[PDB]
Design a binder for this molecule. Structure first.
Ligand code: CLA
Ligand code: CLA
Ligand code: CLA
Ligand code: CLA
Ligand code: CLA
Ligand code: CLA
Ligand code: CLA
Ligand code: CLA
Ligand code: CLA
Ligand code: BCR
Ligand code: SF4
Lengths: 146, 86, 670, 250, 165, 51
């Protein structure tokens, strides 16, 4: 998977990739926040949708690009797009320096679809009741984290 | 950040993955159920803690358990919008 | 067509919602069944069924209101002392409400007349009947008969329209037709009809009673046949409202008939004007607000505002004969409409939220942060200002520094615009009185009135803040970005993000009900204390006035302790010492019950459902031990239901407490 | 063309009313009107009643049909449709027809204020008249906190003079000793105390947050802010004293 | 016209009638014509407030002035000016002086539109084609036509008051 | 107790009445922390922080 070249939102004023959206006060609060999340997708028709930050929007027949403060808003918009049979949408986290981190379809396959090479992280090999008693692990590595 | 743990009782519903609003969970191959897949939480640093995954889990007691850690909150686990911690 | 009106679904409870089709597996199913009963939008079938259900349910409720009117009319004809009240209204308390002699309940009926014992009604129906020229029992009989016929007609129409309307039905969507016919034929062509009714039946009758002929030669004069009296018989020139009728202590009914005629003419002319008037600006509102919930919210807000105008206009713009002196009636007519105004305003906010979640909102939701932020600031400003003038007065009076408090005899906050608002009424420089009772004297507004009006403004603004915050933040928020998918009413989104309890618009209504209740409890208390202190009361032949509260308002209402002592304690002596006293026993008991219910609400308000679920499971263990298995599995109330029950009990108990407190005192004093 | 829209009897719906329906209804919905759309009823009936079909109806069926069709007045005209098609275009283009709240409502001022800022996705860059107008921008920029070319002590002195002069009034009047023969030295002391308290708060802010927008290059961080706060304290003393001097002399 | 085109479609009985029955604008340059409008709008805006202030004072509402003079001042606005305490008048002049200073030196209006004292030109469009907006020219007419009426109205009030009471 | 401080003078129970009212205010003030729950206020705080 190749990460795109998502530029910082303060340096990409008036881009052709921006969908026609009404614009509201719900957008990311500049002058106080420098971490922005960007979601890009390619659509087939200019179908109206709803921005996660209030107000509606119309996609572009080609590429689309939106900027949001939180990853949750990008994921909400991604679910909304996927309901409209729009796959191939990618969500990036932009660092303050401009570093682009590729986040949502991390390995290129959506998390609800099994993909080889993944390993069960935070897996516990027993029923939930199999966890040790908190009283047993006092003042050990797992003092209050049985 | 919270602590989202997946237990062996998982039956590969994928409902927990679909219900997560911040892409914390994912499906990994396994061999402990007829679905040949179990959930995983590789990105719990983005877990807000909404516990929708627990609502969606149909096992007798949740195969996915979210442990809230309030003295641990980060900007991602709090869903901060007006304020950046980076 | 009607062959599909079958009883086969009566036994099948929960048929209307497809979420209840799985059967009553748990007790939550029962509450959901009751919750979705009137939610026609989410119920099964197409949109035409929604229209049929809405219209037929409106007709059924109209039949219910007609049945209630018929019951009041029959009580007045056959269970009342309306005869002696007609003969002498200033010495007989209205009563169309008896109590059976069971369990000693006989102690509730009290002496209203030498031949009648019963519960003093404060609905004002007797004054309405007298203003409606109703003198004989036959007239009330036929009023009750017509109301029963209307009940049957509306019930049959509600039954019919469930099948007369079809998938092609569209008459409800024709908003131009609805507005035009409503406006003209009802507000114009029925207002003039009532003007005709008054000109031809009141002026022939009410002047005859005021002329001292309560005899009216029985039917020889009362039964019309009085075309030698002239329509404007006793207008006495002057201006409508400047000079009241000295006998009945009200505006002359000829002026009321002229008012109705002119208002009907005005409404007809406005209907004609609407063919070409100002438009193309409310047009976005015109196209975007064609939906059930939005029009419901608009109508609820409008009707509630009209209710509060009625509450303020029924008391010191006396229209009804012998009603200004009937102080309990005046108090009830003000306060009941005040409460209805508050409740219907809250409902308007709720349905605005519902419309936002179902339909698509308008432009004002995009700068919602400045709106609901300056609202926050104004609420904080007028809360930290209005209330604290009370806290400042209280603290400095406790410290013994009365010259530093906000009073008339101290630093005084003059009500500048109200004192310069002599425009309203503009009556002559004196008072009006009928019989030992004050009809109306101008409320001299001072510092205390200024402070309490600012308290009213603050409470109104906070309730509006809650309502508008629920409405504007319904679809999404910086906190949760997919609130639209969560629906209209939900407990929360989870303990994450610090905690997301009560983000739904339903929970915003839940808080707004508390704040509206707190808002107009102060309105009720302000009215109840101000009228007693400064308007109502006895008289002295030397033109001196002895009010009921002896002018406590201007000297005590400047401090919270004054409200506690001179209103909630001294004026509660009537209700608290009301045991074994014939008329006011139920009011003392209902005072106690209102306290009990209000405190009972706190169990639902303060607790969560998980504790109750665990307790229910512990009890279910004992039930399963003895082979007593409820297959409708016992589940604790849902979070939203717990909040709803708590709010309902809270408001009901508090309203009952005030209700008893005001009514018992006014019945004792009168 | 579309089959059911041809030769439709005038009795079913009039010609002008049908044209108004077709104009109001979007073009793509003519072939298969959706449902609950007047055009759906027109199709469902014109395919049953017409020249080659059932030419008569029962009086009640025709009465119900006449109450399902539009009554020629509930349909938007061409100018209203233009109003909507252009209002929505403005709203989606990021421009707002400027309106001002009034007595439970708003008056349209007939102005197109471009709404979305330079960063269209930024929530705080939506430009409004009171913050992004020429007068608002030049007023905010010319404040003592923002004025170009002012040394930090000058900003502090100006702000302090304003605060100290204003703060005397609330105490010397309507104060605990408002009626005493002095009644103003008490107000002077209280105003100086308020100035000192807010200056201490500013020192806390500058020693904890340490704003660096007033520091000159190569200086101890927050030194400019601390200098501004100290000179605000000095200016507050001066303004309070000047207000007291004016009150006593005049 | 050439230069009077910068203030075109903004006066006359009907909106597009350059009245000028004295040649006061011909031969004058574009900046002078813009400055002439800046004088017109400023006079009219003050005249509108002057007429409103005259009527709220000639009806009996002079609170600040009844509460400062400790007596109801005369309804006649010209005579009420004399009764108004000299401290009040001097503060009134100073407040307008601060406003006139504020608009001119610190927050100057542009030189192409010297009447934009609030400065809408940086957020306004004024050149789009929407109907439910872009009626800014019409609201310019209503400001000018109302203000021009207020100018002759307030002079009539002062002239009649100072002569025929 | 209620007669402690009034528009007739004060007693040595003035502190008692003032503390009575203050404790009523404290008791009622905790109702909102018990009835109204977090999310409403979190949105309110987000709006204030926006300001
Ligand atoms: C008596 C109890 C009480 C009190 C005092 C408040 C107070 C408040 N509520 Mg609240 N509320 C309550 C009960 C109460 N609530 C209950 C039972 C519910 C039911 C759920 C709610 C539900 C509710 C909602 C849903 C909302 C509020 C809001 C508000 C705020 C708006 C009013 C305001 O800013 O005035 C100022 C606050 C005061 C207490 C006024 C008095 C201030 C004192 C007297 C002056 C200062 C004292 C002085 C500085 C002493 C210093 C302290 C000392 C240590 C030195 C305010 C903080 C609204 C809000 O926050 O919006 C802005 C809002 O949205 N409340
Ligand atoms: C919808 C409004 C309404 C309301 C609130 C009431 C309420 C009441 N009616 Mg009533 N009534 C109504 C409509 C109403 N009625 C109508 C429309 C009629 C005409 C058909 C009557 C005819 C009527 C009579 C003839 C009597 C009452 C009586 C009563 C009282 C006792 C009822 C009783 O014994 O329970 C009966 C409960 C049931 C039958 C269970 C079902 C009670 C206060 C009685 C009363 O006041 O006694 C002194 C009485 O004798 N009512
Ligand atoms: C607010 C009350 C209300 C309203 C708006 C309507 C409206 C309507 N009714 Mg209706 N109706 C009502 C109350 C009402 N009804 C009641 C109370 C009854 C019981 C007597 C009926 C019994 C009734 C019948 C029997 C019929 C109508 C019909 C109609 C339609 C045409 C009638 C007309 O020209 O007027 C129209 C949609 C007629 C219809 O559906 O036309 C096809 C029809 O056949 N209504
Ligand atoms: C020209 C005939 C006429 C007459 C005799 C009246 C007479 C009356 N009107 Mg009225 N009214 C009229 C025309 C008239 N109206 C018209 C044309 C309108 C439409 C704008 C209204 C709108 C109106 C409202 C909205 C109210 C009245 C009210 C009143 C009553 C209070 C009078 C008062 O205090 O006035 C003092 C001078 C009185 C019975 C009030 C009322 O009903 O009080 C309870 C009230 O609230 N009127
Ligand atoms: C014209 C008035 C009107 C109409 C037509 C509606 C219609 C509707 N409302 Mg609504 N509402 C109104 C006024 C109205 N409301 C007002 C004034 C308020 C403010 C309190 C609300 C608050 C409100 C909320 C919060 C909700 C609705 C909902 C709904 C929908 C479903 C209602 C349902 O199934 O409940 C079924 C009916 C009941 C459960 C009635 C139970 C009785 C009540 C709750 C207690 C009353 C106690 C009683 C007065 C005292 C008892 C006496 C005592 C001595 C024993 C429906 C569209 C719900 C919805 O989902 O909308 C889509 C919803 O969540 N409304
Ligand atoms: C408790 C109240 C209070 C507080 C916290 C301060 C705080 C401060 N004062 Mg101060 N001051 C006060 C009351 C107070 N003042 C009063 C009542 C007077 C009148 C006598 C003064 C006269 C005063 C002078 C003359 C000076 C201060 C200065 C200072 C600062 C050292 C500090 C910010 C000094 C300052 O601002 O230097 C930076 C300084 O020179 N104060
Ligand atoms: C423009 C500078 C100025 C002038 C002309 C005066 C003039 C006066 N001051 Mg003064 N004063 C000033 C600055 C000034 N003060 C400042 C900056 C402070 C703060 C330290 C004070 C603090 C001050 C006090 C505390 C007192 C005076 C007093 C006086 C009067 C003797 C006289 C009218 C005295 C007086 O007459 O008070 C009634 C007095 O008690 N002043
Ligand atoms: C301060 C006064 C003033 C000023 C500077 C302007 C300026 C302007 N007006 Mg104008 N106007 C005014 C008052 C003013 N107006 C009033 C009160 C009316 C109502 C009758 C009008 C009606 C009006 C129309 C109908 C039109 C203009 C137009 C114009 C523009 C073209 C230049 C012009 O006409 O001569 C500018 C120079 C002057 C006006 C000189 C001022 C008058 C001199 C000093 C003599 C007047 C003295 C007077 C007779 C005695 C005073 C008392 C009097 C009330 C009886 C220009 C921007 C035209 C325009 O822009 O349309 C595109 C246009 O068509 N004006
Ligand atoms: C051309 C503008 C203009 C000018 C030069 C004046 C000048 C004056 N006004 Mg005035 N006034 C105006 C417009 C104006 N007014 C408007 C538009 C209103 C309606 C709100 C008023 C309402 C008004 C009142 C109610 C009073 C005055 C008074 C006065 C006199 C004392 C100053 C004062 O207290 O003003 C105060 C002015 C205001 C509080 C109005 C503020 C509204 C501004 C203009 C909005 C911007 C002074 C001669 C006082 C007096 O004694 O008159 C002889 C007085 O009591 N004015
Ligand atoms: C009401 C009004 C308003 C407002 C206003 C204001 C805001 C005002 C302010 C004012 C002010 C706020 C003023 C102030 C002033 C100040 C001063 C004038 C000061 C001075 C000072 C001094 C001079 C000092 C000196 C000194 C020093 C510095 C130090 C040393 C000592 C000495 C003393 C030397 C508005 C417009 C909104 C509108 C309407 C009207
Ligand atoms: S919902 Fe539960 S059982 Fe299903 S895949 Fe997720 S963790 Fe496993």
């Amino acid at each position: 998977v190749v990460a795109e070249a998502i530029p910082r939102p303060e340096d990409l004023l008036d881009s052709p990739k921006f969908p026609m959206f009404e614009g509201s006060t719900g957008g990311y609060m500049s002058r106080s926040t420098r971490e922005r999340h960007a979601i890009t997708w390619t659509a087939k028709g200019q179908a109206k949708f709803e921005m996660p930050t209030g107000g509606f929007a119309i996609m572009n027949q080609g590429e689309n690009l939106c900027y949001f403060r939180k990853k949750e808003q990008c994921i909400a918009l991604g679910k909304q797009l996927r309901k409209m049979k729009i796959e191939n949408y990618k969500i990036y986290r932009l660092k303050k320096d401009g570093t682009v981190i590729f986040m949502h379809p991390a390995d290129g396959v959506f998390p609800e679809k099994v993909n080889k090479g993944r390993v069960q992280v935070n897996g516990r090999p027993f029923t939930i009741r199999g966890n040790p008693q908190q009283s047993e692990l006092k003042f050990t590595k797992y003092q209050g984290k049985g | 950040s919270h602590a989202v743990k997946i237990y062996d009782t998982c039956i590969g519903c994928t409902l927990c993955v679909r219900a997560c609003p911040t892409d914390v969970l994912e499906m990994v191959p396994a061999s402990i159920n007829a679905a040949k897949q179990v959930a995983s939480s590789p990105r719990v640093e983005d877990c807000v803690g909404c516990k929708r995954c627990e609502t969606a889990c149909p096992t007798d007691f949740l195969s996915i358990r979210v442990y809230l850690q309030d003295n641990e909150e980060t900007q991602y686990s709090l869903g901060l919008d007006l304020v950046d911690w980076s | 067509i009607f062959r599909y009106i079958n009883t086969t679904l009566w036994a099948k409870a929960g048929h209307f919602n497809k979420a209840l089709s799985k059967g009553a597996k748990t007790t939550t199913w029962i509450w959901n069944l009751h919750d979705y009963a009137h939610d026609f939008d989410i119920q099964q079938r197409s949109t035409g069924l929604i229209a049929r259900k809405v219209f037929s349910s409106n007709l059924a409720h109209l039949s219910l209101v007609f049945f209630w009117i018929s019951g009041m009319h029959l009580h007045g004809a056959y269970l009342s002392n309306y005869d002696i009240w007609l003969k002498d209204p200033k010495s007989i308390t209205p009563s169309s409400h008896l109590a059976y002699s069971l369990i000693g309940q006989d102690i509730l009926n009290s002496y209203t007349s030498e031949y009648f014992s019963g519960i003093t009604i404060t609905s004002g129906f007797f004054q309405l009947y007298r203003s409606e020229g109703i003198i004989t029992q036959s007239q009330l009989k036929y009023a009750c008969a017509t109301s029963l016929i209307a009940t049957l007609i509306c019930l049959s129409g509600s039954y019919l329209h469930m099948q007369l309307m079809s998938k092609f039905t569209s008459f409800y969507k024709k908003f131009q037709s609805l507005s035009q016919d409503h406006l003209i034929i009802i507000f114009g062509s029925r207002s003039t009809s009532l003007s005709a009714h008054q000109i031809h039946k009141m002026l022939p009758a009410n002047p005859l009673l005021d002329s001292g002929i309560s005899k009216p030669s029985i039917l020889q004069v009362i039964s019309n046949s009085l075309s030698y009296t002239l329509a404007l018989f006793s207008t006495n020139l002057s201006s409508t409202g400047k000079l009241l009728n000295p006998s009945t202590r009200s505006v002359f009914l000829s002026q009321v008939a002229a008012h109705h005629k002119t208002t009907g003419v005005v409404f007809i002319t406005l209907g004609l004007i609407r063919f070409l008037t100002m438009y193309k600006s409310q047009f976005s509102i015109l196209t975007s607000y064609i939906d059930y919930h939005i029009v419901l919210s608009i109508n609820l807000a409008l009707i509630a505002s009209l209710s509060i105008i009625v509450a303020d206009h029924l008391t010191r713009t006396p229209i009804y004969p012998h009603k200004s002196t009937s102080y309990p009636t005046i108090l009830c007519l003000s306060i009941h409409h005040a409460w209805l105004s508050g409740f219907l305003i809250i409902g308007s906010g709720a349905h605005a939220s519902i419309f936002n979640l179902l339909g698509s909102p308008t432009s004002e939701i995009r700068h919602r942060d400045p709106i609901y932020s300056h609202l926050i600031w104004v609420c904080i400003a007028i809360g930290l200002h209005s209330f604290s003038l009370y806290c400042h007065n209280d603290t400095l009076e406790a410290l013994g520094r009365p010259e530093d408090i906000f009073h008339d005899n101290s630093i005084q906050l003059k009500a500048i615009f109200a004192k310069q608002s002599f425009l309203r009424a503009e009556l002559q420089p004196d008072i009006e009185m009928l019989d030992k009772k004050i009809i109306r004297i101008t409320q001299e507004l001072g510092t205390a009135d200024f402070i309490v009006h600012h308290i009213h403004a603050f409470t109104i603004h906070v309730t509006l803040l809650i309502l508008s915050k629920g409405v504007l933040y319904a679809r999404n928020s910086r906190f949760v970005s997919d609130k639209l998918e969560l629906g209209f009413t939900y407990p929360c989104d989870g303990p994450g993000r610090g905690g997301t309890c009560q983000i739904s618009p339903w929970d915003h209504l839940f808080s707004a009900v508390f704040w509206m209740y707190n808002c107009l409890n102060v309105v009720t208390f302000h009215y109840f204390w101000k009228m007693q202190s400064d308007v109502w009361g006895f008289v002295s032949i030397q033109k001196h006035i002895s009010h009921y509260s002896q002018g406590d308002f201007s000297v005590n209402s400047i401090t919270i302790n004054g409200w506690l002592r001179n209103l909630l304690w001294s004026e509660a002596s009537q209700v608290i010492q009301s045991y074994a006293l014939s008329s006011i026993c139920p009011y003392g008991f209902i005072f106690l019950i209102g306290h009990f219910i209000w405190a009972f609400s706190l169990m639902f308000l303060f607790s969560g459902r998980a504790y109750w679920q665990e307790l229910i499971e512990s009890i279910l263990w004992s039930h399963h031990k003895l082979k007593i298995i409820p297959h409708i599995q016992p589940r604790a109330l849902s979070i939203s239901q717990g909040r709803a029950v708590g709010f309902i009990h809270y408001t009901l108990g508090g309203i009952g407490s005030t209700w008893a407190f005001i009514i018992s005192r006014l019945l004792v004093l009168t | 063309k579309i089959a059911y829209l041809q030769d439709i009897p005038r009795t079913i719906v009039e010609k002008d009313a049908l044209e108004l329906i077709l104009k109001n209804t979007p073009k793509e919905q003519w072939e298969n009107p959706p449902e609950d759309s007047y055009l759906y009823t027109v199709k469902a009936f014109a395919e049953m009643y017409g020249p080659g079909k059932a030419t008569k109806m029962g009086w009640w069926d025709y009465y119900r049909l006449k109450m399902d069709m539009p009554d020629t007045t509930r349909l938007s005209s061409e100018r209203e449709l233009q109003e909507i098609e252009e209002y929505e275009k403005l709203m989606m283009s990021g421009k707002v027809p400027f309106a001002v709240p009034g007595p439970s409502g708003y008056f349209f001022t007939g102005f197109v204020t471009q709404w979305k800022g330079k960063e269209p996705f930024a929530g705080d860059q939506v430009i409004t008249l009171t913050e992004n107008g020429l007068f608002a921008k030049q007023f905010l920029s010319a404040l003592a906190f923002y004025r170009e070319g002012l040394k930090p002590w000058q900003r502090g002195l100006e702000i302090g003079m304003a605060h100290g002069y204003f703060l005397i009034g609330p105490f010397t009047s309507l104060g605990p000793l408002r009626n005493t023969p002095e009644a103003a030295t008490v107000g002077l002391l209280c105003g100086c105390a308020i100035v000192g308290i807010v200056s201490i708060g500013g020192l806390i802010f500058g020693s904890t947050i340490k704003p660096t927008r007033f520091d000159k290059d190569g200086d101890k961080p927050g030194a400019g802010f601390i200098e501004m706060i100290n000179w605000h304290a000095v200016g507050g003393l001066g303004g309070a004293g000047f207000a007291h001097a004016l009150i006593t002399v005049f | 016209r050439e230069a009077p085109k910068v203030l075109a479609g903004t006066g006359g009985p009907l909106p597009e009638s350059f009245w000028d029955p004295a040649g006061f604008t011909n031969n004058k340059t574009d900046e002078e014509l813009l400055f002439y409008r800046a004088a017109e709008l400023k006079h009219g805006r003050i005249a509108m407030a002057a007429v409103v202030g005259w009527f709220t004072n000639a009806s009996g509402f002079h609170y600040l002035g009844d509460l400062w003079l400790k007596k109801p001042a005369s309804d006649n606005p010209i005579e009420a000016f004399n009764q108004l305490s000299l401290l009040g008048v001097f503060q009134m002049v100073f407040f307008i002086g601060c406003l006139e200073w504020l608009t001119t030196v610190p927050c100057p209006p542009p030189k192409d539109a010297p009447w934009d004292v609030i400065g809408m030109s940086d957020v306004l469009e004024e050149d789009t084609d929407e109907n439910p907006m872009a009626e800014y020219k019409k609201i310019q007419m209503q400001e000018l036509n109302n203000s021009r009426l207020a100018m002759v109205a307030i002079i009539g009030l002062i002239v009649q008051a100072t002569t025929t009471g | 107790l209620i007669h402690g401080y009034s528009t007739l003078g004060a007693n040595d129970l003035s502190v008692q009445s003032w503390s009575f009212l203050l404790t009523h205010l404290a008791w009622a003030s905790g109702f909102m922390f018990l009835i109204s729950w977090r999310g409403y206020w979190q949105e309110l705080i987000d709006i204030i922080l926006y300001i």
